Amino acid sequence: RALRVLVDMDGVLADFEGGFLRKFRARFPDQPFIALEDRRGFWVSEQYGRLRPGLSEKAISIWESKNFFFELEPLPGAVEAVKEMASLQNTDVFICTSPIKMFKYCPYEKYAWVEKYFGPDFLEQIVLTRDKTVVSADLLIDDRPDITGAEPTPSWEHVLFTACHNQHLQLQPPRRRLHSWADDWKAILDSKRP
Ligand SMILES: Cc1cn([C@H]2C[C@H]3O[C@](c4ccccc4)(P(=O)(O)O)OC[C@H]3O2)c(=O)[nH]c1=O
Ligand SMILES: [Mg+2]
């Protein structure tokens, strides 16, 4: 039997936080912003809303804009790590990502992004869903702390991928982290093998 690993896209493969900040500052130069070092909480618009009135609506307009997802930069070592992971024996890798509600560009751009960095053949490994608990696997590497859905008992072990917004979070045992792609991801996968 092959080990199945679900790899998240935003915050794990694609730099959503960095891309957001860069484009927000460029479009709203006279507005206050939040340095990544100061990001707290999964929801960007919520922390921006607390910064000053009207920043939430502006933040939202950034990711709803054409080319936001397509132009995100890969996280350091992400492409290299996933390519190697997918080539490993007895290992099936799927990119499991949740598209935003405004569907005009997001779904399309995510497929285009994967084609760009992983090639045409990797498109077969993409799973788009707003509920990752109904996708079965041994592991789910994702930066969102709370991953819930229709399935109360997911088959996967959620390994928290470190991001600016979750770096200070204390996890309840035996929950663990993958600190970055430079961290030992192979050791994590092996711990799940027969
Ligand atoms: C992946 C990511 C998106 N956003 C943005 C983008 C937008 O995505 C969703 C949204 C909710 C649930 C599943 C998918 C998208 P929306 O419900 O608008 O589709 O929730 C609110 C918004 O929050 C962040 O702030 N941080 C993140 O790490
Ligand atoms: Mg993510």
**What CATH number does the domain containing 58 carry?**
1.10.40.40
Q: What is the enclosing helix (H) or strand (E) of 94?
A: strand 91-97
How far is the C-alpha of 98 from the C-alpha of 130, rounded, in Å?
Answer: 5
Largest CA distance in the chain: 56
Q: What residue ranges line ligand 1, CB within 6 angstroms? A: 10-11, 16, 42-45, 63, 98, 100-101, 130
Q: How many domains does the chain have?
A: 2
Residue 43 annotated as binding site = yes
Q: How far is CA 182 from the centre of its chain?
A: 16
Where b means 16+ CB within 10 Å and e means fewer, 77-88 reads ebeebbeebbee
- Do 23 and 55 lie in one domain? The reply is yes
**What CATH number does the domain containing 134 carry?**
3.40.50.1000
Q: Which residues are catalytic?
A: 8, 10
Residue 42 annotated as binding site = yes
Range of the domain at 158: 1-15+71-194
Resolution in A: 1.6
- Do 4 and 32 lie in one domain? The reply is no
- Do 66 and 1 lie in one domain? The reply is no
The contacts of residue 182 (CB under 8 Å, 6+ apart) are: 76, 77
Rg (the chain; Cα; Å): 17
Structure tokens at 107: 């779904």
What is the experimental method? X-ray
Residue nearest to atom 12 of ligand 1 (CA): 130
How far is the C-alpha of 86 from the C-alpha of 1, rounded, in Å?
Answer: 15
